């Protein structure tokens, strides 16, 4: 008669996979290499975030440009067309 | 054979279905495999065309794949081999 | 109900510490030895796996100081029945010889016929002469319990259905009206003043003042006393326990008088149910195999309608990471659902709630767990913070709705007695007005019972010639084979008690009414009557009363001498070709309502060591697909369904998420793997 | 019935189960060898005519 | 061939109950005619009844008012027996103030224009020196039994006690036929229908409304070509 | 109780008569409650035993089978339908072609022995039929299809794969609650229990061993009645057998000099299955088991086709005992 | 219907939650799965129209513990029912051993195509009519329904509108040209349902003897016409049974209906048996309402001779007691004698 | 008030004269309320005509068998009752049937005087043999319902005239059956299903229309007490 909080609740897994696919789709609809800089910054493929030094190292660029890219990409995703298919997940 | 027309889960009648196969177990597996085939035809429609075909008979507005499979069975549109 | 409170006490249980258990219980202990007569009722025992192990004391029983059960008896010396009542245990009942109360005493203590019904030592029944009788029963219905003594026409009922009636007379729920029965016994009044749930005027006096909350009585000598009521107090099983007064501001009361009715009391006496117009025909198959149909009339006028009060509780304890707080600062939920909550957590009184609503805003710390990358991205996209605290609020469980009567909040700050490591406790009382519906269990006083098959409208119900629709329709096929025709007799007398009779004793008294008591040759409409258990309405007296049943408003004797009436089909229109039995039957509402029983689960909590679903309806819970159902599915040849029900709905830990995903995405159900039961068995074997 | 003695003397005999009844196929969760589980019906090839 | 169309003669018995007699009819038809009219009258006659009450001192339905002998739910049960007839379809409201000892009758209710209370002699509650009962009632029109409308579905202001409404001015309907059925086959039925209303509208108006409902529903079947 | 009750429930019982009725009422209720558990245990054991009885082959091509009565003869030469034909013969595949006085083969090997078939067989004048059944089915692991006959639910030949064993176990276990007890022969559900459990009956009644007249050794308070051998060589001197129980009657009661059969029941009661096996073979012990179970089930008016009890009994008589090891591996 | 069953929508919504979630995601009523789940939990009224779609032709299983035998679990096609109680078809009460005292049943849900096919073909209600034990029907009408059919088909001599062959003054006045005319005469107060009349039937097969008499070999019924002296009730029973079945013309004792349904299941396909059983259910209930079977104490008549009977056996009981008292027999013998005396009484 | 949903009416035609009308969704529970009235009105309101009495020669007191015909008096009577004939006259017109010689007599063999038409073409009403003669004077009058054989309409004055039963109703069999239909989430509205079988005189659609006319007139006689009364407008 004891439940298991440490267990797959079987809606979290499918919801989480759907969130994954939808977030990948919305990231793909973004711009080219800048959505991927967001992907690296939040670590959507490598599993670790890495910092502006590493993003500049892999791309051959500076860090202020990276932060500007982050802010520019971040502004668009607050706009409803990207958010409407993503808001319900949070 | 003058039965009143069936409705719902009993269409087609199982007695006319049983003349196509040996036993009702064979009907069960028949319809299950065919319904699965129809389901993944519906799933694999977005991408390129593969070896799966169906539904050969025209379904309804919204129809479960198993009902389509059993109706195809009754219409003599499939063949099989047992184990 | 108050009767169940009275009958839980006065109960004899043969099981427990120092006594035999049910597995150690033989068959010979569960019978009725002939020494039970007057010391323990042979009717009322639980019907489940406890029959005979649990019974109750008789009405007149008294306990010997050495723990034995004495019983009163009227001593008769040399054939004059005296009044010296002497108490004997079973031994002196063996030694001496016992007569019967329903014997012809000739108004002098003297018997009439020498040849008399009598019990001997070993339970034998013979015909001793009217000279060796030394002891006599105090009254009939001495062998019977309290609850069973409240069944009219009990002597016509079979012992099985009498047992059922006694066991389900204690399961009625307190209705909002609680109308007293028409036909009853003498134990409707004394089973309520003794049960305790009826406020009794301790000492005589005049009423100073009344309200819905208290009664101030003025005693004859200076002193005044305030009796406080108990309004809408929750019982131990979720039912209401209202106590409203029945006295006025100028009335004079005596000591021992009922001054305020209780949960199931009406002007002093017990009322567990309502008087309903009953027909005994089989109607359209809706009253098939013990099913009962009702009128919508019982739904419209709240005839059968209980007020169920449920108690929810939540405590703000201490924890390793810190302390939780009952607050409005909850993590992600729209402010739409925070409208009902007051400024510091718990809901406002009177705010109606549905299933899954928030009752007590309570949030706990969580610590630091590294987020999934996509959670981090989605949080930063909307700018929302981590919100390190985790919400475990008191959500009202599924399948429940109703108002909120009262909120009782403790605190450590007021220095209340709380257990160790608990900061703030709070209980919320949520009540709902459960009406009658299709599926609730209804029952009379003679073991009849049934789920309600259908609530018809008032127009499609067989109505009498005067347009009065019947209220419920029982079935006929359940009457003769269960040998409980008391419900028929209680029906007939019920009609006689409703229309009122008048025996026109113009030329003497009619033959049947010769031994009727006075002021029974005529009665008023809706006049209450009572038949004691083993001396009640004789069948000839029922025929005589039913013969003269003076008309309602016009010249119209709706129910003829046979006890039947010409019903009109309210649905089709044609009159029914044969007359149908109609009457007024007293019927309760049992505590087996649908809302307590309906249950469903698609996915929910899971067990601890084995990974099976939980059960019991307290959680979501699932039904046990046991061994016998496994055999039944094997016999069909059903292989894949059995594989499903034993692998991917119970134990395939990696497979259940796969089946949910495959259903949501519209794919095919994945093939089952090995269950988490066989693997636990394998590891235990290793 | 009598799980202890059956288990211990089976362990002594090293008795290998063959998994061919309707109960040992239910315990381990694979398809039972009756009804729609036998190879005559479990291995039907279904193609459109 | 019998060719005389039936009549609808009337007979007043009391102020609220009356009999109607329809003759002559085709044989084997009076029972079905009476049942049709009964099932219409007893179910689908539009009326008016109280739906929600708001007492000042109560937050919900399961509490008590200080001073009144009665409690809130029995006040609900007593007001559920009220009879009231409106004229307009907006959810009108009426008030009721009472201070001091005495019985609170339905005549103490002050209604606005249009609505009226047809039985001032109804016992609602009884008070004392400390008693003070203020309540507002919401009357609307409708038909049949509607259950209590949940407060959340409504404006959801805490205190609006919702009450089951029964919009049925009819109270009891019966009938009986007197089929002559002579051996010469000039047979005809004779429907003696009976209507008793609960003093909201006269039985004539209830029967007229039932007849118009039936006319409107059978014009559906009549109008084909 | 020798009083007895003399009032109907319409007239209303008196106090003592009602108190007397309560005895039987409560006794019946508790007895029913225990009978549920008894039936459940019987069902579980029969399910375990009959689990591996599943139809595997369409036909085993055997020719051995049982003989069924099928409307025995009357002194007037009239065939009277045997009182239990809808349960014993009906829906069982005939194995030997029934020939009526060299008339014709009314039904051939391969028919289902249905209702119109039985009417034709009765019209033809034949009574004893040889039918294929699950005791004689010559498969290896699981009965064939033509030996089981007709699946009772479907109405056709049982499909290859159906688990007839669990159907049999459930069909013998469900009417274990309708079946009641009584009054030293056991005559209720415990009788069926001691039958399927293959225990020596508490009212054991030893049977004959050889034919011949009887050497009536009646003793005091017990009967040690010997049986003179017809051709045998020794008379079976029996021992103390309580004279309280009576003697089995046939033809008259067991009387001195009466000719007994090879396995005639001497005294009155129930025989054990072990002795009747050891004396008269598996065929006779199978007939005894089926007849004795169906006698109990017929007494309560419960219709059970014999093929279910037949599957159970076939599961009973599988193995053999080793009296001589030969020289190979058998203890 | 026989294959159908009730299912409370407040419970079907929880059984079919993933199916309805997917479907109302597909119909663009929700942006994603999470909004769909919240919409399901708040039960927005459009969740019911989609619930009807996801339920149609998707069987559920109805277990009742204790599952004594194979028919304790059966597959029904679910339908939505107002209320919270599962509506069970009355004809499976014998199989489930389920009266209506408050007995509960568990609904299970098959998921895969294999499991749905097994529920739909193997474990459907209309495919399991007969017992697995003896082949007798368990979908046979019982109880109330048998009373209805009995009252429907019983024959009352001296009833209203009989056939009599009296002539000279007036003709026979018992003949009816068609069952429609008989039904008209029954709606008027002329013909009682249980009167012996002569009807001209053109849509029912006559019994074997009459068919061999009037037509001999190949009398096909949908066109041919034939006379029958029967009750209107037996006709009204016989158009329920299929066309190919001959006329019955009997009084429907329970065993008669058992034999009829046994023959019907042995010779005809299963769907015909299911539909005939459903028709019998409808007629049985409808005419059990009209049978006027009630229980009153004026209905329960006592035997008038009972007192003389009790005296005649009390004298023998008194004789036995006196013989025990004087001492010719012991206690057990007098007990046995009294027992036999009262069994005779 | 508003009906809140408009009921429809659609028919399935099964044979030439056989229909299955469906009305959905009727406001609950109006299914029975209008269905029983419709069923009784169809069978017992629509006017029609049939043979009410017949006189045959050669049958005066022993109404057993008619000379020259294969059948008997009862068979001729039941064959004549099933005959459908229209009418335009309140008075009991007299059809004359007269055929001599062998062979069968058709339903069209009877001469129709002007007006009254024999809708059934050739239904076998007698089988004259041995060169027989048959002469029935039929009496046809219009009516409604099913008036049973009028017993002694006169004092048995025309002894040859045998009073037969009279199926006046053009429709022969109406069976009503309500069901359950979902509206929004109510799942309780009443769907009425009528199975109507008529003879070939009129179409079932026209019979339903005429019965609706008669019922709406009767309930308008009910209505015309206070015309300005509120209730349920569709
Ligand atoms: Mg039960
Ligand atoms: Zn075989």
Author numbering:
A (entry chain F): 438 to 527
B (entry chain E): 27 to 109
C (entry chain C): 444 to 1129
D (entry chain D): 1227 to 1275
E (entry chain A): 2 to 226
F (entry chain D): 832 to 1014, 1023 to 1090, 1097 to 1176
G (entry chain D): 437 to 781
H (entry chain B): 1 to 234
Give the article text:
In addition, the de novo approach of the experiment allowed us to observe the formation of a likely off-pathway promoter complex. While the repositioning of the σ-finger in RP-σ3.2dis likely contributes to the observed instability of the T-strand, this T-strand instability may also be an intrinsic feature of the promoter itself. Furthermore, the repositioning of the σ-finger in RP-σ3.2dis may have been driven by prior collision events between extending abortive RNAs and the σ-finger or simply an intrinsic feature of the promoter. We observe a very noisy density near the RNAP active site of RP-σ3.2dis, consistent with the presence of unstably bound ~ 2nt RNA. Due to this density’s poor quality, we cannot model this RNA accurately. In light of the absence of steric clash between the 5ʹ RNA and the σ-finger in RP-σ3.2dis and noisy RNA density, suggesting RNA-DNA hybrid instability, we reason that RP-σ3.2dis is unlikely to serve as a target for MtbGreA’s stimulation of promoter escape. Prior findings in Eco have shown that RPitcs with short 2–3nt RNA are not susceptible to GreA-stimulated cleavage. Our observed structural features of RP-σ3.2dis and the preexisting biochemical findings of the ‘composite model’ lead us to propose that RP-σ3.2dis is likely situated off of the main promoter escape pathway, chronically generating short 2–3nt abortive transcripts. In addition, compounds capable of repositioning the σ-finger, consistent with the production of RP-σ3.2dis, have the potential to reproduce Rif’s effect of irreversibly trapping RPitcs in abortive cycling on the promoter via a distinct structural exploit.
